[PDB]
Amino acid sequence: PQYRLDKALLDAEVALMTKMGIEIIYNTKIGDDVSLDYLHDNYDAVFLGIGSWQSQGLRCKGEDMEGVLGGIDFLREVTMNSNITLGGKVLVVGGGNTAMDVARTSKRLGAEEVTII
Amino acid sequence: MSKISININGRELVVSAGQTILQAAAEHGIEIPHLCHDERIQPYGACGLCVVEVEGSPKLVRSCATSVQNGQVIRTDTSRTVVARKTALQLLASDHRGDCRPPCMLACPAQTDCQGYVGLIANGQYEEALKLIKDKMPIPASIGKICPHPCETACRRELVEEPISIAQLKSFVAEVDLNGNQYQPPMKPATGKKVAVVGAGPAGLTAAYFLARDGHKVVIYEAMPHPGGMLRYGIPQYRLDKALLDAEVALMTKMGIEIIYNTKIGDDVSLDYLHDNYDAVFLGIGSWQSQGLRCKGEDMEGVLGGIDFLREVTMNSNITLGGKVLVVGGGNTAMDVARTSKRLGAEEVTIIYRRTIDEMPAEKIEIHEAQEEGVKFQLLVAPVEVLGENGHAKALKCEIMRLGEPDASGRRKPEPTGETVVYEADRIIAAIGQKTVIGNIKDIATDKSGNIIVNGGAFTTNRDKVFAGGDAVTGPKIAIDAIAQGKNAAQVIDSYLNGCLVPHADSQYFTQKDITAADLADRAKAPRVSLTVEDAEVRNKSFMQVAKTFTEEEALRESKRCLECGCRDYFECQLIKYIQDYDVSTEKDSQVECHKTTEFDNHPFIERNPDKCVLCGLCVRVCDEVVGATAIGLVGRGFDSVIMPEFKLPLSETACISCGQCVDVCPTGACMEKQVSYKQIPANMDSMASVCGYCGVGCNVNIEYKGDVVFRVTPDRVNDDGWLCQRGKFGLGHANDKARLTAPVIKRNGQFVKVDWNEANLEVVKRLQAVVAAYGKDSIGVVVSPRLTNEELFLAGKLADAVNTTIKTSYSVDGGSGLGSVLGYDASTNSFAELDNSDFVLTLGKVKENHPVLDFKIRLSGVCSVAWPQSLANTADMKVFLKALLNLGVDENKVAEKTEGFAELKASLADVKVSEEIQALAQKYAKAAKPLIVIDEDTVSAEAVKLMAYAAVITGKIGAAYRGIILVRTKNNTQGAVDMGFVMPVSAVAQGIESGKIKALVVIGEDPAAYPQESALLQKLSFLVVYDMFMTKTATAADMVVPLVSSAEVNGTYTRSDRRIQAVRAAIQPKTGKATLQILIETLKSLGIKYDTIADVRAAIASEVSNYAGMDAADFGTTVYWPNNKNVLYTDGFATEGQKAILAAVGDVPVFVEKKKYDSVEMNFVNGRQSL
Amino acid sequence: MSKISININGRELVVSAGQTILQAAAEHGIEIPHLCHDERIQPYGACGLCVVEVEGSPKLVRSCATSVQNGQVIRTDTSRTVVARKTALQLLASDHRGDCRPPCMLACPAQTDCQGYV
């Protein structure tokens, strides 16, 4: 979240790094936009740092109903200044750092009562 | 047609019929004097300066009152016309009282504009003050440090208290702008000429500085290791720092001037070499010899000259002084030698002078400082013999003098009586005087005193291509005299290099010598800013500076004390222009009488001076024929004719509008407008063309500024009619307000704390996101002001779209005028340019009081105008009007096939009776072929506009040229606000707030909370952002305030009330750091919409706003109208869904209830009106 | 003087007396067809391509032969003027023999000007 890490610091550091001669191409998803065979043919080496960008579901009955959303997706829409819906009462399921970030961002986003399960 | 061609002054010109000879000659660059001519009103014939000779006419004709014909021969520069103009100007100068230029400037040898930069310092503009100073000298810090300031002797503040510290202020500005961004003046393109300057003193440096600015290539030949002249090798270090001089010379040599040191002309390089290799030569060698003692034994060892002594001190050479030193002389050379000797370890220094202290040519300040430092003065003593043994001088035998008769110069001549006194001394320094030496330079004639003989005013020696100036010509003087001679010689040399040598001549000004202390007895007294001088204990041992430069607080305090003696109208006055053109003496004879006035007209805006009036009558003619107020008029006959308000009342007790048109047409300083800045001044202001930001009329203005201060606003007589009103003339003072916000503020713990722009952007974006997340769609209202430009309004609409809301509105627009439901577009169907061809104008509302320039145009057009009666304030009277129009025989079939609901309109008027006055108005309207209806949106309800639309539709007077409805909007960009979708009524906003549907509000430029109902409404919100210039009542209730800039700092476009798009240009850079477009662009970039410049936003406007097609390449310097660049709307049918005018019933609407002002700028103007 | 101003094709223009409507429209970038008009000699009235509609006139007027007045409303792109110009051009094209472009160029798919560079 923004209150813990300022994005201006991150942007300034990446600008410092790209001054060194590293080219960053945004909005390019490998396998969906550009093949991996293309990168394999055109480059002397390939490194995959894709990360873990899926959210585990509730693993319960009715987990597919409308009104249930993952924590990672929620934080991504918060970051991109998109249009979200929260409501007065929000229940966050989990106990790691994702749950803490979701709960505190929800408290900042006008949720009147937030409870962690 | 056949090409009407006239022949004037020898040239053959092609002109147009109906024009006067004055206009025709001025169109082709022929200048004819005139004072009482205005091309927009009738001729008068008062001054008589426009007389020409026309063949076939026995007497001179007035070119301001005779129209051009075919094949007429005109001469404007004969003997008769010149004689008549000179006699007229002499008679006019026989009656004029004023100061064209202040006493301080006329006392300066270089004629530096002291009032100008003193008053620019008083406004806080220091770069402009330096730009003004540098027009005369290249080295202002040194000159301000060392000048003996003749200007302060002539200062009129001396009649109140001690005068203004002009030299200290100049030194302050020069050093402040040396230590910051160094200023380099613009230079002309290279001419290919070469000038050699001999010497790098003040005169040579000034000549090189002013010849390099003319485009020439200048080389300076200096005999010394370092440049500066006697400013470096005669001025001691404790009085002038050499670092300042070196920095200034480095600044000058950055401009492209080459200085060659250690090159003595005549000893190292011949003058014939420079004569052959260069296009001109200037000799600024100065006076670099010392006069001897002129006594017995003056050649003995142990006696040295003052100039040589100071030169060896400066070069850090090895000198010998001894314990006791006797300095002979009384000028500034003696003072410098004595004080440098006190610093160089001499235990006792004595000055031998042949007159008294009060008779000394040295400055009293220098004498006082010298006495404080410890040098003793021996007075009325003249040296006779130098005594010594074995060749070493050890004593001075002198004669004792007595005071005698005054000389021709006003100084007593000393006379010996009988007594001699012998003074013991280890060293004897003769600081007697200076002499010019030509050295080995040959073929240059010199005087008996050594000075170079030059032709007076042309600066030419006997040798061709060689010029001279400075101390080499005038002898020893002060430094600003050398600088003035150098600049004048630079001008003369520059004229010579173009092929026509013209000598330098002084100008003629009107001056006032009747000012006494009693005439300034009402001025308050403020003490001078004293100079901080180091203690005399540490001064006697060090070569450190004895005084400090002014601080900024001291400089402001001293500059705010000026009396503003000179005429403010000098740079635009036309009387002094012709006086100096025809060379009329401005001297006055005491045996003739000029009327002196004791006027007391303390109007807050208009200043009238009958002493400077030439009685051209332009002011009364404009106020009678154009404005129609008739607030001033003529009183008397002959000499007693004077222009004054009604019944000799003050101008505030009469029908004056404070428009300022009398100010704008005045050729002299008799009428001036009041000061918008902190302290106005006579200056050449920079001018930027913009449009007025108060009315929907959209008058074009010229903003006149100097740096970052807006000084005045003048009409644009080239691109428009050239009229203004009070809000356009005087309404741009809020740009100079000190109460404007500078940084965004966020409310934490009930206190506003300043933040950065990034923190403010993040806060507003995140809070709007929080409101949307908690409460969903349409929970945010965007309330804008119609004073913003079209790009600002487009970006505000995009921001409303990005936060998922449809409530975009404005308190000033409040839902439009209702013409859109009837015709399709909520806009006027015709332009202002078609008001001159109508034969009937029907005025609805108070057009005169709200949009007065529109009334000026209607009155000057001369068409028949009928106002809607005030006793018809009911809509039922308008229904009677419609019935009377229908009974006069309109075509039912055309309006039946072109409209919807005409049958019900006819049915609803079945039992309507018609009165006499209604019948007369309907007959007047229906009789005329091409009528217009001008509706004032401020004082007319929506139903009256709809009924005027119904009348114009059923009659058939719509959708054609010179026929239709003109609608005058309340604010400058009300049309632009309507076009971008800000047409929601504010009743919906109030209802949504009180019903819990609307939780956040974005307010841009408005103040709804000045009224208790809207304030109690805003108290129920959850979040509120206010974008405003001032911390108004609404911004105090907000959780966050973001500043806005004024209209003088924005670039964009405004849409006029007749659908004309005009370019708005930024006079001064934004004082908050960012403009409104930049703020909105940053916020939208945070939200995910990418725009970079205003060109991208204009392309987006042209692609998204439906009727603005062509804004990308519109070139708003010309006339642009948004519907297909068409002046007339509905030429091919109405804009409704079925291409038909929708006529529907309108209820009984009672008498109108006056509207309120919600824009913060308008109420700022209204409240500031009561402050004066 | 008084700024003689006409209103043509929806726009308001400031012109000079004595000029024809053809000259006045061409000075302000409004294109009216003409074939038999030369501004240095007298009007002829042969082609009829310069016809405009002027309010107050029942029939189309030839803008090459009528001088501008004050406050007259002119339309150049109506149905009647376009129909008259198309009929005139059809009658003229009924009598014209010539090759606007050579056979070599018209046979090229890219319409390269073969005659020009040859």
Ligand SMILES: Cc1cc2nc3c(=O)[nH]c(=O)nc-3n(C[C@H](O)[C@H](O)[C@H](O)COP(=O)(O)OP(=O)(O)OC[C@H]3O[C@@H](n4cnc5c(N)ncnc54)[C@H](O)[C@@H]3O)c2cc1C
């Ligand atoms: C001791 C002293 C104190 C003064 N104090 C003040 C003061 O407090 N305030 C004030 O306003 N004025 C003061 N003045 C006056 C002021 O310094 C001079 O009037 C002014 O500088 C004149 O400059 P100039 O250009 O005429 O010649 P200068 O500046 O005197 O000399 C110009 C240059 O010509 C060069 N030169 C000479 N001969 C040749 C040659 N043959 N070839 C090449 N180059 C040559 C010299 O090297 C010199 O650098 C003082 C003067 C003196 C002597």
Ligand SMILES: NC(=O)C1=CN([C@@H]2O[C@H](COP(=O)(O)OP(=O)(O)OC[C@H]3O[C@@H](n4cnc5c(N)ncnc54)[C@H](OP(=O)(O)O)[C@@H]3O)[C@@H](O)[C@H]2O)C=CC1
């Ligand atoms: N990279 C990081 O920053 C780290 C991750 N986290 C947390 O762990 C998550 C992912 O890492 P990892 O620890 O491998 O993920 P896990 O699969 O271990 O899940 C982590 C959290 O969810 C609980 N959990 C998992 N499955 C279920 C289920 N069916 N029902 C209820 N609770 C469940 C765990 O509690 P329990 O203690 O009982 O296992 C713990 O609170 C993050 O989303 C975050 O919440 C925390 C610290 C470091």
Ligand SMILES: NC(=O)C1=CN([C@@H]2O[C@H](COP(=O)(O)OP(=O)(O)OC[C@H]3O[C@@H](n4cnc5c(N)ncnc54)[C@H](OP(=O)(O)O)[C@@H]3O)[C@@H](O)[C@H]2O)C=CC1
């Ligand atoms: N350029 C400058 O900065 C100015 C120069 N000075 C002084 O004037 C000198 C040169 O200018 P200028 O005034 O034309 O020079 P002058 O020839 O007038 O001499 C000036 C000084 O010397 C005195 N003096 C002159 N000749 C003799 C002599 N035989 N015996 C005794 N005293 C004499 C004068 O006093 P008296 O009053 O009796 O004439 C005065 O003190 C400088 O050296 C300086 O001392 C001062 C102000 C401006």
Ligand code: SF4
């Ligand atoms: S240069 Fe000297 S005389 Fe001129 S304004 Fe400055 S102080 Fe006054």
Ligand code: SF4
């Ligand atoms: S009061 Fe101001 S304007 Fe008047 S002489 Fe002094 S400095 Fe100049």
Ligand code: SF4
């Ligand atoms: S009105 Fe003109 S002539 Fe008269 S004092 Fe002012 S500038 Fe000089």
Ligand code: SF4
């Ligand atoms: S006040 Fe000005 S405009 Fe009026 S008559 Fe005198 S000089 Fe002319």
Ligand code: SF4
């Ligand atoms: S300000 Fe306007 S209304 Fe007042 S006297 Fe001058 S011209 Fe007349």
Ligand code: SF4
């Ligand atoms: S009439 Fe309106 S637009 Fe014109 S100057 Fe006055 S306030 Fe400004």
Ligand code: FES
């Ligand atoms: S008499 Fe013609 S301008 Fe004054």
Ligand code: FES
């Ligand atoms: S141009 Fe041919 S008829 Fe006018």
